[PDB]
């Protein structure tokens, strides 16, 4: 919704669901790339929000969620590229 951490929370689920479409029409790869771009942007926003909460700790859960989300995006690109390859291999041997 409004908060960055819940936007990222939902967008992670969405991005994971795109990998297994119950559709028939395969991957919506352009929408997936658009989502990962938005995920990166929102990540940066959450990072800035956490950073700018103490001037120049009890902000540990936010840092943990941030780290695990950055690791998620990094692995998700590998998962996506794999799925993209698999989807064209499958639609050549049919």
């Amino acid at each position: 919704s409004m908060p960055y951490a819940t936007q990222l929370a939902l967008l992670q689920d969405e991005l994971l669901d795109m990998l297994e479409p119950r559709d028939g029409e395969g991957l919506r790869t352009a929408d997936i790339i658009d989502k990962t771009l938005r995920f990166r942007e929102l990540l940066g926003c959450y990072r800035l929000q956490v950073e700018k909460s103490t001037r120049q700790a009890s902000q540990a859960p936010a840092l943990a969620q941030l780290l695990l989300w950055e690791r998620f995006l990094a692995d998700y690109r590998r998962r996506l590229d794999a799925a993209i390859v698999h989807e064209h291999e499958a639609t050549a041997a049919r």
Binding site: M2, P3, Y4, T29, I33, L37, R38, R40, E41, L42, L43, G44, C45, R47, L48, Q49, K52, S53, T54, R55, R77, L80, D81, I84, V85, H88, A92
Partner: protein
């Protein structure tokens, strides 16, 4: 070592004696000879024996070739007049089976054009093709003809010549029937091709380029429309013809690029960034078929095309920007600011373009081809561009903030000169008359910045950096240099919220620590006007000294001041007096 030559040429001289008896030699004997001669092949001592054995196989295959080709043509097996049935197909499969068995006995391995069964299967097409056709549009028409024939005959001929018992698989028939049907097209095309590759005229060199490009296109369509995982017409392209095509394509791309990096003295515009982006997309649309074709002796140029176009050109473009323009010394301050905004926009736009390229399938594949041949552990080929772009983005972002803040320091000079904050007539209804100019300027500035697209987090970064610089300006140049009325302070708070308002900050969210501190300092400042019991105690100059070393254990809990430092709380309290 010589004990294996006078002994080797003994079996090798008995092979020639059994070969000298061509008749009264059944297929079994041909296998026995293959068994003996096979090891000694390529020796070059047994080369004569090979040459004889192969030309014997060929003579043993000449008659079933004429028969299979006659039967295929005289029964019209590739038209609607023929159906595949246990009776009308029986003899065809015998003649083709024997031809295949004979071809597999060739030493050391049969040539591509020696698979006699497939040559016969393709003969009908060869005659139809040569009859109907006696450049790019020609090659396209050849594909149209080839495709129609393949469509209505490929799976039919697979149903006809399937023979698991003799090794003729369905996968093999699918590959080879297409390959051999393709051979008369290779020969026809490669005549006009070698006819052009023997000229240095520009008209020629371009006609050769277009020819090669059309070959790539048709090979691609063949792989897609009929699921063909064999060689197309790419076999015709020699390394000398590729070098020509590759250089023509890189030259075309650089020529377009250089017409965009021509330094005008006018303020930079987004269009140039979008046009370079379109250049990269168009050049990728053109190079897509070539990239998708899987020939190993092609990788050498595919990497060359990837680097020189999709790495080098983006890097050079970054340096197109960030570049000393003595022609741009006549720019306004607000013009230099917008010029930088546009630069950062363009750069990040090309970045996302490359991000999209990095997930298209052809790139993923030839990225692994590169990670395998060069043994370089690249995640994406664009890592070297992104990491080089991420630097320039910071330099640009910092430049925007600095140039913006420098201007704000300038427009607040009037508002800075005002010193009557201790004698305020009434409560605030509008903004301080000397701040109106700055507020207007700051709105003009955020509107200029907002003209263009940036990633959400980079927007937040720049605008927060300015909220902080606004706070520092208000605190050091105004607050920490005056003492305030009841409504003087209310007026200042108004002024601050007006300046924060002009940034159009992504709001309804949380607040920065620096702003929380700002309003805590205001909150303390505001005890000068409420005569509470627990406020006369705190607003004592001696309470400040006597409690400063406790970090104001009392005051912190009483007033929820949790972002100010000891010295800061002290200065606020002292400022109330």
């Amino acid at each position: 070592a010589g004990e294996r030559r006078a002994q080797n040429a003994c079996t090798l001289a008995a092979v020639t004696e059994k070969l000298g008896r061509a008749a009264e030699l059944d297929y079994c004997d041909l296998e026995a000879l293959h068994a003996e001669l096979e090891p000694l092949a390529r020796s070059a001592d047994a080369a004569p024996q090979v040459e004889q054995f192969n030309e014997l196989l060929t003579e043993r295959a000449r008659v079933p070739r004429r028969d299979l080709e006659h039967e295929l043509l005289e029964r019209r097996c590739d038209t609607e007049l023929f159906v595949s049935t246990d009776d009308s197909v029986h003899e065809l499969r015998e003649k083709a089976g024997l031809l295949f068995q004979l071809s597999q006995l060739l030493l050391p391995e049969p040539r591509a054009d020696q698979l006699w069964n497939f040559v016969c299967m393709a003969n009908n097409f060869r005659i139809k093709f040569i009859y109907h056709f006696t450049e790019q549009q020609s090659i396209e028409n050849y594909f149209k003809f080839l495709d129609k024939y393949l469509s209505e005959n490929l799976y039919k001929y697979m149903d006809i010549f399937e023979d698991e018992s003799k090794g003729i698989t369905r996968t093999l028939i699918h590959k080879q029937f297409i390959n051999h049907i393709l051979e008369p097209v290779r020969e026809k095309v490669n005549v006009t091709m070698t006819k052009i590759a023997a000229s240095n005229s520009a008209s020629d060199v371009k006609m050769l380029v277009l020819l090669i490009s059309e070959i790539f296109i048709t090979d691609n369509a063949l792989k897609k429309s009929h699921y063909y995982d064999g060689v197309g017409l790419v076999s015709l392209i020699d390394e000398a013809a590729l070098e020509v095509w590759q250089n023509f394509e890189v030259e075309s791309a650089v020529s377009q690029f250089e017409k965009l990096t021509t330094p005008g003295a006018s303020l930079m515009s987004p269009k140039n960034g979008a046009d370079f982006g379109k250049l990269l997309e168009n050049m990728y649309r053109y190079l897509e078929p070539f990239f998708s074709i899987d020939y190993r002796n092609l990788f050498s140029v595919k990497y060359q095309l990837v680097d020189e176009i999709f790495i080098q050109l983006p890097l050079k473009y970054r340096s197109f920007l960030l570049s000393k323009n003595i022609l741009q010394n006549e720019l306004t301050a607000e013009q230099q600011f917008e010029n930088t905004c546009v630069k950062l926009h363009s750069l990040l736009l090309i970045s996302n373009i490359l991000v999209r390229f990095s997930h298209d399938f052809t790139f993923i594949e030839m990225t692994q081809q590169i990670n395998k041949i060069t043994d370089s552990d690249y995640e994406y080929i664009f890592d070297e561009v992104w990491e080089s772009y991420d630097e320039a983005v910071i330099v640009l972002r910092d430049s925007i903030v600095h140039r913006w803040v420098k201007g704000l320091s300038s427009s607040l000079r009037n508002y800075f000169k005002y010193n009557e904050w201790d004698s305020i007539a009434t409560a605030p209804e509008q903004c301080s008359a000397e701040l109106v100019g700055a507020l207007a300027w700051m709105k003009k500035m955020t509107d200029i910045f907002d003209k263009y697209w940036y990633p959400q987090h980079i927007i937040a970064q720049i605008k927060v950096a300015l909220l902080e610089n606004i706070i520092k300006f208000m605190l050091n140049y105004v607050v920490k240099l005056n003492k305030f009325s009841e409504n003087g302070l209310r007026q200042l708070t108004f002024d601050y919220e007006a300046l924060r308002a002009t940034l159009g900050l992504p709001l309804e969210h949380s607040s920065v620590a620096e702003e929380l501190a700002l309003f805590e300092y205001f909150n303390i400042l505001s005890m000068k006007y409420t005569n509470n019991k627990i406020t006369s105690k705190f607003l004592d100059a001696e309470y400040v000294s006597s409690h400063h070393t406790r970090n104001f254990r009392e005051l912190r809990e009483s007033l929820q001041v949790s972002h100010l430092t000891s010295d800061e709380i002290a200065d606020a309290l002292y400022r109330t007096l």
